[PDB]
Ligand binder design. Structure first.
Ligand SMILES: [Cl-]
Ligand SMILES: [Cl-]
Length: 162
């Protein structure tokens, strides 16, 4: 298992514009297009992301290209962030994947707001970070996915995904 397989499980694949759990226009493997209610605004972000006239539909290869870019941008956002980088460097490989999953979902600004959880992850207080992570809008809105990520941070294994 790895970050690509983990995120593909959590996010799914859809080849046609759709609204995510928040009601935002999304396509591919969790690639957020725009928070605006306008479908025309989403189609135009899509054409621009892909470099052609999509009419709201993309192929599998294009979905995978966006996906690759987004995973890469999530990693590089972690490393440029003063709050995230120290935590990330302190973690083993499996739990590093859990951090990327969260950033991918909620952006680096969002995760960097999990100050107390971050401090506990850094101190390797796994059970306590799990409890504090669960006290969040994130967990209450998307509990199945959140539990999978929390379990990964708690155990250091891919068990929640196997
Ligand atoms: Cl893009
Ligand atoms: Cl969920």
């Amino acid at each position: 298992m790895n970050i690509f397989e983990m995120l593909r499980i959590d996010e799914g694949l859809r080849l046609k514009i759709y609204k995510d759990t928040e009601g935002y226009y999304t396509i591919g493997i969790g690639h957020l297009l725009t928070k605006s209610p306008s479908l025309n605004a989403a189609k135009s972000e899509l054409d621009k992301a892909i470099g052609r006239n999509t009419n709201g539909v993309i192929t599998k290869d294009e979905a995978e290209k966006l996906f690759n870019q987004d995973v890469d941008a999530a990693v590089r956002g972690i490393l440029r962030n003063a709050k995230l980088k120290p935590v990330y460097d302190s973690l083993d490989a499996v739990r590093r994947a859990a951090a990327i999953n969260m950033v991918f979902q909620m952006g680096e600004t969002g995760v960097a707001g999990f100050t107390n959880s971050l401090r506990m992850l850094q101190q390797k207080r796994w059970d306590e970070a799990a409890v504090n992570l669960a006290k969040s809008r994130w967990y209450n809105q998307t509990p199945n996915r959140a539990k999978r990520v929390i379990t990964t941070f708690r155990t250091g294994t891919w068990d929640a995904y196997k």
